[PDB]
Structure formats: C-alpha cells, structure tokens
Amino acid sequence: TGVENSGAGPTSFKTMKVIDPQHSDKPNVLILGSGWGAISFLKHIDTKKYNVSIISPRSYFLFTPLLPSAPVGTVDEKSIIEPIVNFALKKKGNVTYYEAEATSINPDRNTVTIKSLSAPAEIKYDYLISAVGAEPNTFGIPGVTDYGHFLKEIPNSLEIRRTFAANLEKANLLPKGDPERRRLLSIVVVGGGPTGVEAAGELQDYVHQDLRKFLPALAEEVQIHLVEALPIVLNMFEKKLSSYAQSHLENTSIKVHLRTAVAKVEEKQLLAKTKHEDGKITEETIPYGTLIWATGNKARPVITDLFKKIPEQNSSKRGLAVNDFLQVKGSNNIFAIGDNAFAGLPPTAQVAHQEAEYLAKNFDKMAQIPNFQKNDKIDLLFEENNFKPFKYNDLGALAYLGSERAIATIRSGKRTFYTGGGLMTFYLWRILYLSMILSARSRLKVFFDWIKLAFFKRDFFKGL
Amino acid sequence: TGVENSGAGPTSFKTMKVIDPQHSDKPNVLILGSGWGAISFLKHIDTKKYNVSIISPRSYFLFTPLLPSAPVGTVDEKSIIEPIVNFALKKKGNVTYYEAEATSINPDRNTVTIKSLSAPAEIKYDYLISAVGAEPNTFGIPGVTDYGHFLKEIPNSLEIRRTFAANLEKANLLPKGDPERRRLLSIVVVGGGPTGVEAAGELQDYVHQDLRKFLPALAEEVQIHLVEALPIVLNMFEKKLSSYAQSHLENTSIKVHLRTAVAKVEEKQLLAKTKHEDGKITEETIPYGTLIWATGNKARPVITDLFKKIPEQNSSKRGLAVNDFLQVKGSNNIFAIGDNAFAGLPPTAQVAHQEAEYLAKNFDKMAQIPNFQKNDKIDLLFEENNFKPFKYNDLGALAYLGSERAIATIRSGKRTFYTGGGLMTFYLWRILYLSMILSARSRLKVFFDWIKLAFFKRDFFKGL
Ligand SMILES: Cc1cc2nc3c(=O)[nH]c(=O)nc-3n(C[C@H](O)[C@H](O)[C@H](O)COP(=O)(O)OP(=O)(O)OC[C@H]3O[C@@H](n4cnc5c(N)ncnc54)[C@H](O)[C@@H]3O)c2cc1C
Ligand SMILES: Cc1cc2nc3c(=O)[nH]c(=O)nc-3n(C[C@H](O)[C@H](O)[C@H](O)COP(=O)(O)OP(=O)(O)OC[C@H]3O[C@@H](n4cnc5c(N)ncnc54)[C@H](O)[C@@H]3O)c2cc1C
Ligand SMILES: CO/C(=C\C(N)=O)[C@H](C)[C@H](/C=C/c1csc(-c2csc([C@@H](C)/C=C/C=C/C(C)C)n2)n1)OC
Ligand SMILES: CO/C(=C\C(N)=O)[C@H](C)[C@H](/C=C/c1csc(-c2csc([C@@H](C)/C=C\C=C\C(C)C)n2)n1)OC
Ligand SMILES: [Mg+2]
Ligand SMILES: [Mg+2]
Ligand SMILES: [Mg+2]
Ligand SMILES: [Mg+2]
Ligand SMILES: [Mg+2]
Ligand SMILES: [Mg+2]
Ligand SMILES: [Mg+2]
Ligand SMILES: [Mg+2]
C-alpha cells in the first residue's frame, strides 16, 4: 500500500516539487536507510525520471568519521548530523521520507514492510535500494550489551559521556587511595581499528587537555586501555605507520593490549585472554569504569530474514552477495550497497559512497532504455546494452591518534599519492575530513567547533 | 578535605588554591545558587580575604535572557550556559561547590541543610548570601503544571522543542481540513512580558523561516497566540513602544490577547476570559497543542521555610525582605539578593547584577574594620561605620519581537541615551546582549550560533 494518512514514523512527509500525473509515469525507487549509501545514492539519482522514496528510522544522516569526537565534545553531536530533508530540497523532482524501519522485505510480493514504534502497513517498490547498514558484533562474548557501549550512532555518543561523567563524579568522592576510585576512572576500548583508536585517543585528549585543568587529582588516575585481538593496530596501513601510531598512543599514557581477545565482560571487569607469539595463552582481568566496543559488524534481521526468501542467498553470511551490477543474486529489482551488501570489499564509507554513486549513474543509463520500461534470470539487460560492471578504487586510509597527531595514506589506482606523518598530517586530516563532509551546514559547525576548541575547553555536559 | 560528602551531590568540586590552615581565621561565606545573583557575587568577592562556598543543584550559570531562543534552535542550549567551576577557576583563593539544593536554612544554628537529590547534612557559615531565584507561578489555575511548560531552565527548552516537534510530526499525517490538525499546530504563550513575547516571537520565526521552507502545508496552519492579563504587552516599555511591539507581533501573524486571563487549562484546550473596554467579561476556548506558560514568579519553599524562623519575616509573602544594606531583616549574618529578595524592586537580572557587585564591595569594605568579629537594629553597625546604601541605576529595557525587529530603551537615572526602533535596534540589541554575556565561551558560541543562522536554518532536532 503506502498511501495517505497512515502511521509509520511521523516525519512521513511528502515534498511536492515538480508536477507529475496520477497515472504512474516513473518507476518507484525506494531507498532503505539514511546513511552513507542511501544519502550518497539519493544525492545524485535523477528524480525527474524516478520517484524516490526513503525509509529510515533515523531522520538525519551521520558523518560517521567524526563520531568518536562527539562523546568528549571535540565536536557537538549536532555539528555532524544532517536531516534527510535538506538533501531532498536538492533533488529536482519528488521525494518521500517515511520515518520507520524495514522489517521483512518481501521480494516477490514486492514491498518493504515498515512497522515503526511511532504509528498493510507495507510499501510498494518498482526498484529497491537496500543500504540499511550493519549493526555491531559482540561475537556472543557475554556481557557486552549488558555492560558495554557501542560507538555506532548519535545516542551511543551521548551514553558514553553520561557514563564517563558519572564515574568522574563518583570517583571524586573517594579518598585518593581507594582502588574503586582507580576503577571508576579506567577506560577500556575494545577495537584496534580507526574508530577505537580515535575514541581511545579522543578521551585521553579530553583527560589531558581539559579534565586536569580543574580536577587534576582525577586526571592522573584516569586510565585508558585499548584492546585488540590481532598482532597490531590499524591493519589497513603499512606496518611502518601502525607502529608510529602504537608508539604515540602509549606516549599519551594509553595501555595498548595487542594480541588480546575479550572472553567475557562482567560488570566491573572484563576477563581478557592473551595469546603471545610464543603461543602461550595467558589470562588477565581488566577492571573498567567505561567500556567501549568498537569492533565488528554483523548483518541485520531485515537482511538475515531476506536470506531465506531468495534461494541463492540461503548461504550468504556477511551481507547480501551482489553481482557486478550490484543487484541481489537471486532477485531482479532489488539492489544492495555498503555494509549490508557483500561485494567482497572493505566495509567502509568510501566503498558505500562509490557503490552508491556508480549505481546512481547506472540508473540514468536505464531510463534511456525503452527495454527497461518492461522486462527468472536478471542480469541479461545489462549486457545487451553494454553496462560497465563496478570495480573499486580504494583511495587510502586516515586515522587520528590523539594529542594532535595523525597518520594517513592516499591513493588512486596503483599510484599512491601521499603518506604521513605527525602534526602536519593532523592538519590535512582536519582539512580532508572537512571536505568529505556532505553538507555546508555540518562543515561550518565542525569548523566552528575546532576554532572554539582552540580558545576553550570541550563541552562535557552530561545532560546535553 | 578530605571527604566531606553526606548530603551534597556528585559535582562537589573543590579548588585547593591558597594554603589553608585547617584552623581558619578568614571568614566563611556561602552563596546559594548559580544564577544571576550568586554568580555575580562570586565574580567580585575577594577570595583572599574571604572563603566562599556554593550550593546549587545546577552546575552551570544560565544567561537567562537568551533562553527563549533555544527551543527553536535560534541558539543552542550549550551556547548560553557556563559552569561554576569555570568562574571559580578564575579566582584568587579557595572556592568550593557542593552541587546540591538547600532544603532548610537554619538561622539561629548558623547552617544550611542540603539534601541533594543525588546523595546531618548541614553546612556551616559565618556569612550567608541567599540568591536561589524564584520559581514560576500558576496562580492555582488548575491544569498548568500538567499540560503546560514553564520556560525557566534549560530542560524546559528541550521539553518544549520535543513537544512542538511531536505535534508537527503528528499533525502532518492528518488531512489539511481537520480540526485536530489545526489544534496540534496552535501555540499559546501565557504572559506577555518580554519573555512570553520573545518566545512567541522566536517560535513564529522558526515557523515562518524554517518550517515553511519544507512544509508550508503545516507552516501556514501553525498559530501562535500570546495571552496577557494586562492592558498591554511589555508594560515596562513606555506606552508608545508597547503598541509598536504589538503592531509587529500581530503583523507577523501572532494573535495577541490583551486584558485576558486563563481561568483553567485542560489537555486539548484552555478556557480563557477577557475583560473589555466597557468592563464586560466574555469567555472563550483557545485550543492548543503546545502551552508555554511564561508568567509570574513565586516564593521558593526554602525561602518560605525561612519566613517562619524569623519574626520579621513572619508576614513576608513575596520574598525575604531586606534593608538598604541587603541584609535579611531579622538576621545579622544572612543576606538576600535577586528574585528571592523583596527589595521592593522589579525581579530583573539587571537588579541582581547590581545587588551583587554592590554587596561584594560592601564585603570588601568589611576588610578595613576589625570589630565585626568581636560583636537588635544590627543595621546600625553599618550606618555608624558610614556604609553607602544600595541604589538601583536603572539601565533600561530590551525585548526582541520576531522577524528581525526589536524594541529598546537605554538610560541612566533620567539621562536617556536612546529608545528605538527597528532592524537597527535588533542589531544593537544583539550587541547589547552579546556584551552582557558573562563568559568568553558563551559569547563565542552565541556569536557562531547567529552566524550559522544567517548562512543556514535553525537546528530543530527532537533528541538533541
Ligand atoms: C564511529 C565510526 C567511525 C567510522 N569512521 C569511518 C572513516 O573514517 N572512514 C570510513 O571509510 N568509514 C568509517 N566508518 C564506517 C562507515 O561509516 C560505514 O561502513 C558506512 O556507514 C556504511 O554506510 P551504509 O550506508 O552501508 O550504512 P550506514 O551509513 O550505517 O547507514 C545505514 C542507514 O540505515 C538506517 N537503518 C538501519 N536499520 C534500518 C531499517 N531496518 N530500515 C531502514 N533503515 C535502517 C540507519 O539509520 C542508517 O541511516 C565508521 C563507522 C563508525 C561506526
Ligand atoms: C526565559 C527568561 C528570560 C529572562 N530574561 C531577562 C532579561 O532579558 N532581562 C532581565 O533583566 N531579566 C530577565 N529574566 C529574569 C531574570 O533573569 C531573573 O530575575 C534573574 O535570573 C534572577 O537571578 P537570581 O540570581 O535571583 O536567580 P536565578 O538567576 O534564577 O538563579 C538562581 C539559582 O539558584 C539555583 N537554585 C534554585 N533553588 C535552589 C536551592 N534550593 N538551593 C541551591 N540553589 C538553588 C538555580 O539553579 C539557579 O542557579 C528572565 C527570566 C527568564 C525565565
Ligand atoms: C566524499 O568522497 C571521498 C573523497 C572525495 N575527495 O570526495 C571519499 C570517498 C570519502 C572518504 C573516505 C575515507 C576517508 S578516511 C577513510 C578510511 C579510513 S580507514 C578506512 C577503512 C579501511 C576502514 C574500514 C573498517 C572497517 C570495519 C567495519 C571492519 N577508510 N575513508 O568518503 C567518505
Ligand atoms: C550591562 O550590564 C548590566 C548592568 C550593569 N553593567 O550595571 C545588566 C545587569 C545586564 C542586562 C540587563 C537587562 C537586559 S534587558 C533587561 C530588562 C529590563 S526589563 C526586563 C524584563 C525581562 C524582566 C523583568 C521585568 C519585571 C517587571 C518590570 C515586569 N529585562 N535587563 O546584565 C544582564
Ligand atoms: Mg551512516
Ligand atoms: Mg545507508
Ligand atoms: Mg552501518
Ligand atoms: Mg549499507
Ligand atoms: Mg540564572
Ligand atoms: Mg542566583
Ligand atoms: Mg530566578
Ligand atoms: Mg535570587
């Protein structure tokens, strides 16, 4: 259905841009999500030839690479989100955002089922764009999600402060010696990837740069462990850099735990195992005030539910396996991009950003084809008209290390433009992250956020 | 300290500045609150000759004038607050803040009982500076607390935005010609002092500027009413100005209800009554989605608690009555300033920023007279010393109106510098306010707020 006067998420709003007919003139494309995929895919697609619809529980778009800077308020949570709406005021034709969530996609009955928590109730789709993202992975390691914080989404950032704020508080009522005070003030990040390292760093920044400047008795006793399973951190960088980073984290009093896996999280301590290069399996408990879980990504119910309803997708695990034109293997009119598509690619923004932009332009290709105005094998039409299959141009990797330092690589093709570095690198990272932001609103807010951060402390209000 | 926690809540910070002999000879001074009076008094007290400690459940100062511009993201709630610590960090001597609330003042036992919501538990004092503010008042009109929203404190801003969004949301799923949609978009501000005005003003902005740019279907139907019991809005501005303000309010589509009083408040609607030129009371139902009740202050219960414990304050209705030396009539060592003090002046912030600065210089002027500590018309102690009493240098009256306009009136004694005006006044007004802000950080943040507003919309997130 998907008609007038229902109840999904209340920003089920329609923007009557151009002048269409009531007899359906265009294909109804329906996007799932409002993140990198869906916003990148929306940002380009020809709205004159297609009737774009978006289904997102979230009504803003998240510039994920600056999220780890939110909790301490290096950046404000607003300063890095954008409403979907503003990207639709930049589309010539017609859009509609339902503020709900996909639940079961019904591939052959040909709808996405939106049931919200803010109320049929399905939505007809001619084509489907499935960029819902991955949800983070605990590995069945018990205790996470009882006692952990995922660094995924804006609320997650608010939860992490409120927690750390509350510990800083409780902690400052105990006599200096007390171990408990020592515990409250400890931080465990679990995740050696960029996210974790950046959170790890951004906290330690705050503690050195801000906290001590008015309660130095606490600053000291703050401890920030960073825990990773593999031989070293930042594995996407060439060995020589990953080391400089690990140098600089420990330089900033970070307790890096390489080759270490979390077997279980209890309330106050997380039982860790370590397997050394001389294969010796040692144990260790790590007590924690605040636990951050910056690791992994698994598939979502919508998708793992879909796996069954498409014979080819029975045994895909990571995401939806996709052919070279990014359609679901097993379905005609259903596509998948970014973290929920299994392209055999890095699960990153860069990939999803390209993935979407290519698919966007291929949608302009198909409109020129009368053959696509109507018609269980599927790819055929993409060959008959000579469509380029998607190939990826991995552009390199940035990561921020703490107390004003960074490392990076940039590339195009086999060519490898640049690679830092230290305090210089920092200013590119800033200058570069700025440019990759998808809105002038957001960028000015972040810009102002860093200028403000020079003259003054971060804003660490627990109720805001 | 040490460990003096028993009543007082978490952010019990202490700055170990000067070297303190356990057994002290400096007097001990207590400031109740963290707003205009208290923070003004904190700023100008000599922290070397005295020892100052504070009690406030609120860990931040609030630039109360800008509050009404936060609910519609004209300005961020963080931009207008600044922490106590941040002020106390720029002092000479030892400051301490027990983040809690006074529950009982104990005049004849020299203590203030503090039961923090977050936890004996008395605090000892030589001198007491009672500056807790007043609370807002319902005049026992049934319904206000249930369905209404005060506009007194930061959380109230979030409460309103949340409310208004949820209605904008719920309304857009109903068809243009529904009553229930008309209602949800109705907005009644009760009380036409510059608050209710500026508020009403700043909403209509968001409707007229933000909302319409993406839902004119909703925007148009949004109605803002301003109810006021008196002949005119903004009585403290001179007669001719009150009419131009009202001209401009009504001319920006704001239904202004003079000589009108809210007899009661129900969920969907509020019954109001209006006395006419001819002295005949009519009735009326105003149905409403959002109810901002910005009218009249009343006596805090700690202040009312302390009316029974002093014979002079037995017939004290409005607030603690004080002499020309701002001292609680009937106590020696307690002082009341701000809206908890009934100094027969208006309950402005302007008053309190004077009431403080003055008392601080008094307090400093009690550092060349070594008899007070070797001490029934106890104001004579000051009169015989030849203490200049307190006099209010009324600096004026400001009020923003909506849609880029403002009214103003700077003066001193009689010598009136100015009285506008239009788009020029809005600019001055901005400038005056921006100057009167108490911290660099607040200022800058407020300054970048306004810039971002010219470039981009406002920020109306219902979870941030
Ligand atoms: C803290 C953090 C920092 C990162 N930093 C970087 C970086 O610096 N560089 C980099 O390349 N990558 C980074 N990433 C990874 C990158 O952001 C992701 O790979 C990218 O977000 C994938 O985009 P996507 O569109 O596939 O999914 P997302 O961007 O996650 O978008 C998924 C969207 O779908 C919505 N949604 C969820 N469930 C449903 C449902 N059932 N129905 C409808 N909609 C739904 C979500 O609200 C969201 O809008 C980071 C990730 C995190 C968590
Ligand atoms: C939205 C709004 C806008 C305004 N704009 C203006 C304006 O432009 N110009 C103007 O002159 N006036 C304005 N006012 C009025 C003016 O701000 C007040 O008269 C002024 O705040 C009084 O200051 P105060 O120090 O007496 O109390 P406040 O400034 O309210 O501060 C009182 C403090 O006491 C704390 N507190 C309360 N109870 C307790 C307790 N039991 N124990 C400990 N602490 C406690 C509070 O958290 C607060 O920090 C405005 C008021 C509002 C609500
Ligand atoms: C906006 O478009 C872009 C560049 C441009 N000049 O416009 C880029 C595509 C832009 C930047 C991408 C980018 C910057 S920096 C970075 C990065 C750092 S690290 C990483 C990968 C290798 C990490 C993946 C981790 C995955 C886990 C979930 C397992 N990617 N990606 O896309 C967001
Ligand atoms: C310039 O600095 C100041 C004093 C000084 N330097 O001595 C002031 C205290 C300054 C501004 C005060 C101000 C601005 S605008 C205003 C005012 C006049 S009137 C009013 C209404 C809102 C409040 C109460 C009215 C009560 C009855 C008269 C109805 N507000 N007062 O600090 C905030
Ligand atoms: Mg995203
Ligand atoms: Mg997406
Ligand atoms: Mg994702
Ligand atoms: Mg995805
Ligand atoms: Mg205040
Ligand atoms: Mg005060
Ligand atoms: Mg007050
Ligand atoms: Mg007061």
Numbering used by the authors:
A (entry chain B), B (entry chain A): 28 to 146, 164 to 419, 425 to 513
Manuscript excerpt for this entry:
A monotopic alternative NADH dehydrogenase (Type II NADH dehydrogenase: NDH-2) catalyses the electron transfer from NADH to quinone via FAD or FMN without a proton-pumping activity, and functions as an initial enzyme, either in addition to or as an alternative to proton-pumping NADH dehydrogenase (complex I) in the respiratory chain of bacteria, archaea, and fungal and plant mitochondria. A series of studies has suggested that Ndi1, one of three NDH-2s from Saccharomyces cerevisiae, would be useful in replacement therapy for mitochondrial diseases caused by complex I dysfunction. We reported that the enzymatic reaction of yeast Ndi1 has a ping-pong mechanism, as is the case with NDH-2s from Mycobacterium tuberculosis and Yarrowia lipolytica. In this reaction mechanism, two substrates—NADH and ubiquinone—bind to the enzyme sequentially, but not at the same time.
A Lineweaver-Burk plot analyses indicated that stigmatellin is a competitive inhibitor whereas the others are mixed-type. There are no significant differences between the structures of the complexes, as indicated by root-mean-square deviations of 0.58–0.76 Å, which were calculated for 454–462 superimposed Cα positions. On the other hand, the electron density corresponding to myxothiazol extends from the si-face to the re-face of the FAD isoalloxazine ring. The bithiazole group of myxothiazol is located adjacent to FAD and forms hydrogen bonds with the FAD isoalloxazine ring. The binding cavity of myxothiazol is constructed by 10 residues: W63, P238, M280, P390, T392, Q394, H397, A446, L447, and M485, six of which (W63, Q394, H397, A446, L447, and M485) are also found among the residues lining the cavity for the head group of stigmatellin at the STG-1 site; four residues (P238, M280, P390, and T392) are specific to myxothiazol.
